[PDB]
């Protein structure tokens, strides 16, 4: 949800936060039985009964509304 309220550049932050959640699940799984992390993630991402998740759909949304119209490529720095 935090990703969905921000531009495309925030996807790196999302990835870090997802990784902390993965570590959290791992630490908790030593003592508790939880649904698999992938299952948890796919559900939250609405990617269980749908082919493209929320992250994929927000990326295209931001490409269409922010990246394509507002960004300037610098070929020397990539």
């Amino acid at each position: 949800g935090r990703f969905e309220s921000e531009d495309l550049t925030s996807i790196v932050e999302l990835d870090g936060l997802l990784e902390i959640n993965r570590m959290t699940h791992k630490l908790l799984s030593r003592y508790l039985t939880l649904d698999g992390f992938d299952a948890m993630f796919r559900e939250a991402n609405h990617n269980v009964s749908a082919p493209y998740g929320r992250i994929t759909l927000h990326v295209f949304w931001e490409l269409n509304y922010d990246f394509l119209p507002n960004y300037c490529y610098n070929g020397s720095t990539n």
Partner: protein
Amino acid sequence: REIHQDWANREYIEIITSSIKKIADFLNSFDMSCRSRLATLNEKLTALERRIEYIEARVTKGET
């Protein structure tokens, strides 16, 4: 005399009561051990039920 027979009678009593307590002890520690085992079985079964619900949903369409 009757006191010597009383000593034998109460020793016998002591042996039976001791054995009853041993049965009770076993019954309590058997209950506790099975409580753990049933909890473990429920834990695994609940997880397996959840996983199936999930896998099924990956292969089935949602409700309109």
